[PDB]
Design a protein around this motif. Structure first.
Motif, PDB file in Angstrom:
ATOM      1  N   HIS A   1      -0.569   2.134  -5.326  1.00  0.00           N
ATOM      2  CA  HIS A   1      -0.478   3.354  -6.381  1.00  0.00           C
ATOM      3  C   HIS A   1      -0.253   3.007  -7.554  1.00  0.00           C
ATOM      4  O   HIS A   1       0.856   3.534  -8.065  1.00  0.00           O
ATOM      5  N   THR A   2      -1.283   2.573  -8.314  1.00  0.00           N
ATOM      6  CA  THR A   2      -1.199   2.117  -9.843  1.00  0.00           C
ATOM      7  C   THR A   2      -1.063   3.359 -10.692  1.00  0.00           C
ATOM      8  O   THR A   2      -2.006   4.224 -10.626  1.00  0.00           O
ATOM      9  N   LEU A   3      -0.126   3.487 -11.412  1.00  0.00           N
ATOM     10  CA  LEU A   3       0.252   4.760 -12.056  1.00  0.00           C
ATOM     11  C   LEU A   3      -0.728   4.604 -13.524  1.00  0.00           C
ATOM     12  O   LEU A   3      -1.136   3.653 -13.870  1.00  0.00           O
ATOM     13  N   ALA A   4      -1.127   5.924 -13.936  1.00  0.00           N
ATOM     14  CA  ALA A   4      -2.273   6.111 -15.025  1.00  0.00           C
ATOM     15  C   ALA A   4      -1.857   5.498 -16.332  1.00  0.00           C
ATOM     16  O   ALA A   4      -2.597   5.441 -17.280  1.00  0.00           O
ATOM     17  N   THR A   5      -0.381   5.136 -16.451  1.00  0.00           N
ATOM     18  CA  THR A   5      -0.024   4.839 -17.785  1.00  0.00           C
ATOM     19  C   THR A   5       0.983   3.610 -17.572  1.00  0.00           C
ATOM     20  O   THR A   5       1.649   3.204 -17.291  1.00  0.00           O
ATOM     21  N   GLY A   6      -0.194   2.273 -17.826  1.00  0.00           N
ATOM     22  CA  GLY A   6       0.364   1.051 -18.361  1.00  0.00           C
ATOM     23  C   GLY A   6       0.814   1.130 -19.865  1.00  0.00           C
ATOM     24  O   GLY A   6       0.087   1.811 -20.559  1.00  0.00           O
ATOM     25  N   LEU A   7       1.890   0.150 -20.074  1.00  0.00           N
ATOM     26  CA  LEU A   7       1.998   0.210 -21.420  1.00  0.00           C
ATOM     27  C   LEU A   7       2.268  -1.358 -22.140  1.00  0.00           C
ATOM     28  O   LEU A   7       2.900  -2.036 -21.416  1.00  0.00           O
TER      29      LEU A   7
ATOM     30  N   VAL B   1       0.871  -1.098  -0.140  1.00  0.00           N
ATOM     31  CA  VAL B   1       0.039  -0.159   0.015  1.00  0.00           C
ATOM     32  C   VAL B   1       0.995   1.106  -0.164  1.00  0.00           C
ATOM     33  O   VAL B   1       2.045   1.109   0.510  1.00  0.00           O
ATOM     34  N   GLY B   2       0.593   2.281  -0.776  1.00  0.00           N
ATOM     35  CA  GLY B   2       1.267   3.605  -0.967  1.00  0.00           C
ATOM     36  C   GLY B   2       2.496   3.338  -1.826  1.00  0.00           C
ATOM     37  O   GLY B   2       3.358   4.225  -1.669  1.00  0.00           O
ATOM     38  N   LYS B   3       2.610   2.219  -2.635  1.00  0.00           N
ATOM     39  CA  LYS B   3       3.520   1.857  -3.485  1.00  0.00           C
ATOM     40  C   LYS B   3       3.213   2.341  -4.966  1.00  0.00           C
ATOM     41  O   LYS B   3       2.195   1.586  -5.317  1.00  0.00           O
ATOM     42  N   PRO B   4       4.173   2.901  -5.711  1.00  0.00           N
ATOM     43  CA  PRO B   4       3.807   3.256  -7.173  1.00  0.00           C
ATOM     44  C   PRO B   4       4.259   1.985  -7.948  1.00  0.00           C
ATOM     45  O   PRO B   4       5.186   1.339  -7.528  1.00  0.00           O
ATOM     46  N   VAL B   5       3.197   1.670  -8.723  1.00  0.00           N
ATOM     47  CA  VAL B   5       3.477   0.337  -9.572  1.00  0.00           C
ATOM     48  C   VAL B   5       3.269   0.834 -11.063  1.00  0.00           C
ATOM     49  O   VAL B   5       2.296   1.456 -11.351  1.00  0.00           O
ATOM     50  N   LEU B   6       4.341   0.614 -11.888  1.00  0.00           N
ATOM     51  CA  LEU B   6       4.146   0.833 -13.360  1.00  0.00           C
ATOM     52  C   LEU B   6       4.148  -0.488 -13.981  1.00  0.00           C
ATOM     53  O   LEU B   6       4.832  -1.492 -14.064  1.00  0.00           O
ATOM     54  N   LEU B   7       2.916  -0.539 -14.871  1.00  0.00           N
ATOM     55  CA  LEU B   7       2.355  -1.899 -15.309  1.00  0.00           C
ATOM     56  C   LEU B   7       3.067  -1.782 -16.978  1.00  0.00           C
ATOM     57  O   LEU B   7       3.085  -0.909 -17.261  1.00  0.00           O
TER      58      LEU B   7
END
Length: 174
Positions: free
Chosen positions: A130-136, A97-103
Protein backbone atom coordinates in the motif's frame (compact mmCIF):
# COMPACT_ATOMS: atom_id res chain seq x y z
CA UNK A 1 -4.98 -2.24 19.30
CA UNK A 2 -5.50 1.52 19.95
CA UNK A 3 -2.07 2.51 18.64
CA UNK A 4 -0.17 1.38 15.49
CA UNK A 5 3.38 0.04 15.64
CA UNK A 6 5.62 2.02 13.27
CA UNK A 7 9.10 1.13 11.99
CA UNK A 8 11.65 3.42 10.31
CA UNK A 9 14.49 2.55 7.93
CA UNK A 10 17.05 4.88 6.37
CA UNK A 11 19.74 3.73 3.96
CA UNK A 12 22.54 5.98 5.25
CA UNK A 13 25.18 4.27 7.37
CA UNK A 14 26.71 7.49 8.72
CA UNK A 15 25.94 8.54 12.33
CA UNK A 16 24.87 12.22 11.98
CA UNK A 17 23.09 11.70 8.65
CA UNK A 18 20.28 13.83 7.20
CA UNK A 19 18.28 10.70 6.35
CA UNK A 20 17.93 9.64 10.01
CA UNK A 21 16.49 13.08 10.84
CA UNK A 22 13.86 12.56 8.13
CA UNK A 23 12.75 9.19 9.41
CA UNK A 24 12.76 10.43 13.02
CA UNK A 25 10.57 13.39 11.99
CA UNK A 26 8.13 10.92 10.32
CA UNK A 27 6.88 8.65 13.17
CA UNK A 28 6.48 11.62 15.61
CA UNK A 29 3.66 12.83 13.29
CA UNK A 30 2.10 9.31 13.33
CA UNK A 31 3.00 8.49 16.99
CA UNK A 32 1.55 11.91 17.93
CA UNK A 33 -1.49 11.34 15.66
CA UNK A 34 -1.81 7.61 16.55
CA UNK A 35 0.93 5.18 17.57
CA UNK A 36 3.34 3.95 20.22
CA UNK A 37 7.09 3.40 20.44
CA UNK A 38 8.34 3.53 16.86
CA UNK A 39 11.27 1.30 15.96
CA UNK A 40 13.75 3.76 14.52
CA UNK A 41 16.99 2.26 13.35
CA UNK A 42 19.77 3.40 11.07
CA UNK A 43 21.52 1.01 8.73
CA UNK A 44 24.60 1.20 11.02
CA UNK A 45 22.60 -0.98 13.44
CA UNK A 46 22.09 -3.70 10.83
CA UNK A 47 23.74 -6.85 9.50
CA UNK A 48 25.18 -5.08 6.44
CA UNK A 49 26.56 -7.94 4.31
CA UNK A 50 27.82 -10.00 7.31
CA UNK A 51 20.03 -15.01 9.12
CA UNK A 52 22.55 -15.66 11.89
CA UNK A 53 21.97 -14.16 15.36
CA UNK A 54 22.90 -10.66 14.34
CA UNK A 55 21.07 -7.35 15.11
CA UNK A 56 17.84 -8.69 13.65
CA UNK A 57 16.15 -7.23 16.72
CA UNK A 58 16.44 -3.96 14.79
CA UNK A 59 16.12 -5.10 11.21
CA UNK A 60 13.97 -8.01 10.18
CA UNK A 61 11.51 -8.84 12.93
CA UNK A 62 10.45 -5.26 13.61
CA UNK A 63 10.04 -4.65 9.90
CA UNK A 64 7.68 -7.53 9.16
CA UNK A 65 5.42 -6.99 12.20
CA UNK A 66 4.91 -3.25 11.65
CA UNK A 67 1.54 -1.70 10.91
CA UNK A 68 3.14 1.29 9.16
CA UNK A 69 6.43 1.60 7.28
CA UNK A 70 8.50 4.66 6.45
CA UNK A 71 11.34 3.97 4.04
CA UNK A 72 14.10 6.30 2.96
CA UNK A 73 17.43 6.25 1.18
CA UNK A 74 20.05 8.79 0.02
CA UNK A 75 19.98 9.15 -3.75
CA UNK A 76 23.24 7.66 -5.02
CA UNK A 77 23.86 7.07 -8.75
CA UNK A 78 20.35 8.12 -9.82
CA UNK A 79 18.74 5.56 -7.48
CA UNK A 80 18.83 4.27 -3.90
CA UNK A 81 21.96 2.87 -2.29
CA UNK A 82 23.26 -0.67 -2.50
CA UNK A 83 23.12 -1.35 1.24
CA UNK A 84 19.49 -0.23 1.25
CA UNK A 85 18.66 -2.75 -1.47
CA UNK A 86 20.56 -5.54 0.29
CA UNK A 87 18.11 -5.21 3.18
CA UNK A 88 15.21 -5.37 0.72
CA UNK A 89 16.71 -8.38 -1.08
CA UNK A 90 16.35 -10.40 2.13
CA UNK A 91 12.57 -9.93 2.39
CA UNK A 92 10.27 -12.76 1.27
CA UNK A 93 8.50 -11.69 -1.95
CA UNK A 94 4.98 -11.63 -0.52
CA UNK A 95 5.83 -10.51 3.01
CA UNK A 96 4.46 -6.94 2.82
CA UNK A 97 0.97 -6.92 1.31
CA UNK A 98 -1.63 -4.59 2.83
CA UNK A 99 1.17 -2.61 4.48
CA UNK A 100 1.36 1.19 4.11
CA UNK A 101 4.75 2.45 2.97
CA UNK A 102 5.83 6.10 3.05
CA UNK A 103 8.62 6.79 0.57
CA UNK A 104 11.30 9.39 1.23
CA UNK A 105 14.64 10.31 -0.29
CA UNK A 106 17.49 12.75 0.35
CA UNK A 107 19.86 14.05 -2.29
CA UNK A 108 22.37 16.76 -3.10
CA UNK A 109 20.10 19.23 -4.85
CA UNK A 110 16.46 19.39 -5.90
CA UNK A 111 17.37 17.30 -8.95
CA UNK A 112 16.89 13.49 -9.14
CA UNK A 113 13.39 13.62 -7.74
CA UNK A 114 12.02 10.80 -9.96
CA UNK A 115 13.48 8.23 -7.57
CA UNK A 116 10.11 8.14 -5.82
CA UNK A 117 8.17 6.98 -8.88
CA UNK A 118 10.78 5.13 -10.95
CA UNK A 119 13.02 3.57 -8.29
CA UNK A 120 11.23 3.09 -4.96
CA UNK A 121 7.64 2.58 -6.08
CA UNK A 122 8.54 -0.30 -8.48
CA UNK A 123 10.39 -2.04 -5.67
CA UNK A 124 7.54 -1.67 -3.19
CA UNK A 125 4.98 -2.50 -5.86
CA UNK A 126 6.85 -5.76 -6.34
CA UNK A 127 5.73 -6.49 -2.79
CA UNK A 128 2.22 -5.23 -3.65
CA UNK A 129 2.46 -2.81 -0.70
CA UNK A 130 0.00 0.00 0.00
CA UNK A 131 2.28 2.77 -1.29
CA UNK A 132 1.07 6.19 -0.20
CA UNK A 133 0.28 8.94 -2.68
CA UNK A 134 2.96 11.24 -1.32
CA UNK A 135 6.61 10.30 -1.45
CA UNK A 136 8.90 13.19 -0.60
CA UNK A 137 12.29 14.04 -2.02
CA UNK A 138 14.19 16.54 0.09
CA UNK A 139 17.29 18.56 -0.76
CA UNK A 140 20.12 19.58 1.58
CA UNK A 141 17.91 22.27 3.14
CA UNK A 142 17.35 21.12 6.72
CA UNK A 143 18.78 22.25 10.08
CA UNK A 144 14.01 17.35 14.14
CA UNK A 145 16.07 19.24 11.56
CA UNK A 146 13.80 20.54 8.79
CA UNK A 147 13.07 23.61 6.66
CA UNK A 148 10.35 25.12 4.48
CA UNK A 149 7.71 23.22 2.39
CA UNK A 150 9.07 19.74 3.22
CA UNK A 151 7.54 19.80 6.71
CA UNK A 152 4.04 20.35 5.38
CA UNK A 153 4.61 17.64 2.77
CA UNK A 154 5.78 15.30 5.53
CA UNK A 155 2.95 16.15 7.92
CA UNK A 156 0.42 15.64 5.13
CA UNK A 157 1.99 12.35 4.02
CA UNK A 158 1.63 10.75 7.45
CA UNK A 159 -2.03 11.85 7.33
CA UNK A 160 -2.46 9.35 4.49
CA UNK A 161 -1.69 6.49 6.90
CA UNK A 162 -4.86 6.76 9.00
CA UNK A 163 -7.05 7.31 5.95
CA UNK A 164 -7.37 3.60 5.17
CA UNK A 165 -8.09 2.61 8.77
CA UNK A 166 -11.52 3.80 9.90
CA UNK A 167 -13.79 2.55 12.71
CA UNK A 168 -11.07 0.86 14.79
CA UNK A 169 -8.68 0.27 11.85
CA UNK A 170 -11.18 -1.76 9.83
CA UNK A 171 1.72 -20.51 -7.76
CA UNK A 172 3.13 -18.63 -4.74
CA UNK A 173 2.62 -18.91 -0.98
CA UNK A 174 4.69 -17.83 2.02
Amino acid sequence: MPGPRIVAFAGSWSRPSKTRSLVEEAARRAVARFGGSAHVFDIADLGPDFPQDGPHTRHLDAFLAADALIVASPVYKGSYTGLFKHFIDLIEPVALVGKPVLLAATGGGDRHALVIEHQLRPVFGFFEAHTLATGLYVSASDFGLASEAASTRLDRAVAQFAAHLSRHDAHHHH
